[PDB]
Amino acid sequence: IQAKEYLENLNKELAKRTNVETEAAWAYRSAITDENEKKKNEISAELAKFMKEVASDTTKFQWRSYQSEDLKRQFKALTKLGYAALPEDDYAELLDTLSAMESNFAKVKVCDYKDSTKCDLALDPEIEEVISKSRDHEELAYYWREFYDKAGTAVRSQFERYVELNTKAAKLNNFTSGAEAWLDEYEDDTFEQQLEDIFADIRPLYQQIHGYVRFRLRKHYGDAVVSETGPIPMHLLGNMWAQQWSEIADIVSPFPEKPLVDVSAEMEKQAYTPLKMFQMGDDFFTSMNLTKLPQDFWDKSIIEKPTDGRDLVCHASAWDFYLIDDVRIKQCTRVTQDQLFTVHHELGHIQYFLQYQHQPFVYRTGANPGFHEAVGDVLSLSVSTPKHLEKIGLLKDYVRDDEARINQLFLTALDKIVFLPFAFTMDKYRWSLFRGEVDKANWNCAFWKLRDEYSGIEPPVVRSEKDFDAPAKYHISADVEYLRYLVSFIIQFQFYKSACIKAGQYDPDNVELPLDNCDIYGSARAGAAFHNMLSMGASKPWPDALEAFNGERIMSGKAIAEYFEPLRVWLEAENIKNNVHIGWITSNKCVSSHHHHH
Ligand SMILES: [Zn+2]
C-alpha cells in the first residue's frame, strides 16, 4: 500500500514550488522594494495553502504504522507544518509583521557623530567599521545608542504580535510553544540540558578571558570608563552585539610586542578582491576532493555591495534554489580577515546544498540546524592558522615563538569561546517569551539581565522598559533560530578535531602537531568524511550524520577545550600575576526612566 510514489511526486512539486518562493525572497533581499515584498509574501501565501491542502491529504496514507521508516520519516516531516498551520488571516499578518521587522532592520541609517549632515551610514560599511576601529568610548556609545533605538525599539509592536502568532502556530502543530518547536529540530528531548552542561564546563574558561579582557580595557580606556568587578560596557568590545571581541585585539592581546595575526592589511596591499577571496574559498573545497562551485554560482551571486542607491539585505547568506546546481551567495564582502572567514562559512552552506541535491526535497536540509553553520567554520579554522596563512603568502615572516602562540589561541578565544554564552542567551531569551515565562512589562530587562547573567556584558548607556533592544540583532528581527550557532561552535571543533586526525596533521602526542595549527587543506580523507556526512542531508537523525563522519554519536565540548587548553592554563596564572578580578556583580543598566528636566 505504498506511499513512496506519492512522496516522490510530492517532493518534486514542493521543490518546484519552493524554487518560486526562493526567487522572490532573493529578488527582495537584493532590492528592497514594496513590489518585491508583496510578491514575496504572495508566493509564501500560495504555498501555505498548498501545504495545508497537502497536510489534509496525508490523512489518506496512514503512515503512523508503515513499514520502511525512511518513508515514514518523510511523512512526519511534511505533515509538520510550521507557520502554515496558521489560519489564512494570521499567516498574511505574520508575513507582514515579519516583513516590517526585516525591512526596518535593513533600512537603518544614522548620521556621522562628526557630521549631522550625512545621515546615510548603514550597519554594513560605515557603522560596523566604526565600532571596530574607533577607541573613543563616547563615539562608540553614540553609534550604539543610535543603532539600537532604530533597529530595536522602532519595532516592539511587530515583535510582540510575532511572539503571539509564533506561539499560536506552535500549538496548532502540537508544540508547547515555538520554544519547543525549534528544539524539535535537534530531535532529542534532553538537548537543552546537554547544551547547559557543556556551557557549564566552558564557563570557567569564559571568565578567564572575560576578567582579563576587562583588565586591559580599564587599563586602556580608564577607571571612570570601565570599572573593575562590573560588567563590561559592550561597545568597547568592538562588536555591536559584543558577540565576538577579536576586533579589539590591538589593545587586548597577551603580547602586543609579538605578532598578532591580522592578515587584513596584506590582503589589501596584495590587490585582493572579493572574487579572489571566493576563488580561494572554492579551491579549499576542491582541494579536499569536494564539489566545486557550479557555473550558476559565479553568474547568479552577488559578492559585492551594489553601487546604486538601492536598499537590500546585506547580512551575508547562502541560498539553495532547489534545482540542480543553482546555488548562490549574497554578501557585501570587504577585503578583511573576518570576511575571509565569513566567505568560507557561507561556502560551507553551499557545499551542503550541493552535497545533498539528489536527496528527496524533505531531506534537502541539514542534519539538525547545527551542522549547516559548522561546515564552513571548520575550514575557516584552518585558514586562520599561521601554518596555512604562511602557505598562501598572507603571512610574511612569522615565528611561532611560544608566546606568539598565546596571541593566536586567545584570538580564537575572542571569537569561538566568547560567543558560546552570547549565542545561548539569544534563544534562551526568545524561548522565555515563546514560553509565557516573562511579562510584557519586563521584556527589555529580561533581555539584559540575561546578557548580564551569562556574558557579564551591559549596555553603554542606561536602558529602560521604554526601549526594546532584542531586535537590533539581525536574527531576532529576521526570525532566524539562533541555537544553531551555539551547537555549531561546539560540534565544529569535533569535526575539525577528527578532520585533522583523518589527515596527518593532529596527534594528541606529537608536540610538533598542535591541534591549533593543523591545516587540513588538500586532504582527501578529510573531504571524504565531510562527504559521508553532508551527502546524507537530514535523511537520518543527526547522531548518524555525525557517526558517518567519525563514528562518534554524541555532542560534546571536549574539542574546544582540548584546543584552547594551552591558552586556558595561561589565564589562571596571568590573571593572578596582574591580580585580575574574576566574575562581576549584577548590572544597573536596565531601569524605567529618569529625567533632569521638568
Ligand atoms: Zn550560516
To which H or E segment does residue 318 belong?
Answer: strand 317-320
Residue type present at position 400:
R
Residue indicated by cell numbers 516590517: 100
Among 574, 527, 543, CA closest to 379? 527
- Burial classification of residue 111, based on how many CB atoms lie within 10 Å of its CB (0-12 exposed, 13-18 middle, 19 or more buried): middle
* Residue 186 near residue 99, CB atoms below 8 Å: no
Of 315, 475, 531, 581, the active-site residue reads 475
Say how far apart CA 215 and CA 208 lie, in whole Å.
11
What number of H helices and E strands is found in the chain?
23, 6
In whole angstroms, give the CA distance from residue 161 to residue 487.
29
C-alpha 29 to ligand 1 mean position (Å): 16
User: Measured between alpha carbons, how far is residue 227 from residues 65, 66, 311, 476, 573 in Å?
Assistant: 63, 63, 40, 30, 22
- Burial of 160 from C-beta contacts in 10 A (0-12 / 13-18 / 19+): middle
Instruction: Look at strands 327-330 and 317-320 and give their pairing.
Output: antiparallel
**Cα 595 from chain centroid (whole Å):** 38
Cα 392 to middle of ligand 1, angstroms: 25
CA dihedral sign, ordered 480, 486, 487, 488: positive
Give me the DSSP letters along 398-454.
----SSSSHHHHHHHIIIIIHHHHHHHHHHHHHHHHHTTTS-GGGHHHHHHHHHHHH
User: Has 220 been annotated as catalytic?
Assistant: no
Quick one: cell of 235? 561597545
Region class of 112: left (phi > 0), else alpha (psi between -120 and 50), else beta: beta
Rounded to whole angstroms, how far apart are CA atoms 275 and 188? 41
Euclidean distance between CA atoms 63 and 167, whole angstroms: 27
- Please give the radius of gyration of the chain, using alpha carbons only, rounded to the nearest integer: 24
**CA 259 to each of CA 237, 394, 396, 409, 418: distance values in angstroms, whole numbers, following the listed order:** 21, 14, 11, 13, 21
DSSP, res 573: H
Resolution (A): 2.6
User: How many residues appear in the chain?
Assistant: 598
List, as one string, the DSSP characters of 478-525.
TT---HHHHHHHHHHHHHHHHHHHTTTT--SS-TTS-TTS---TT-HH
Query: Domain segments of the chain: what residues?
Result: 1-598
Q: Is 358 a catalytic residue?
A: no
In this structure, which long-range contacts are made by residues 291-294, counting pairs with CB atoms below 8 Å and at least 24 apart in sequence?
A: 291/351, 291/354, 291/355, 293/327, 293/347, 293/350, 294/325, 294/326, 294/327, 294/354
Q: E strand or H helix at 193, and its extent?
A: helix 191-220
329 CA distance to ligand 1 centroid (A)?
11
| 373 assigned binding-site residue | yes
Hey, what's the cell of 115? Answer: 557630521
Closest CA to 563 of 474, 498, 502: 498
Q: Which of 346, 458, 531, 581 is catalytic?
A: 346
| 3-state percent breakdown (helix, strand, coil) of the chain, nearest 5 | 60, 5, 40
Whether residue 349 is annotated as binding a ligand: the answer is yes
Which helix (H) or strand (E) is 330 found in, with range?
strand 327-330
From residue 456, give the alpha-carbon distance in Å to each of 246, 247, 451, 462, 560: 17, 18, 7, 16, 21
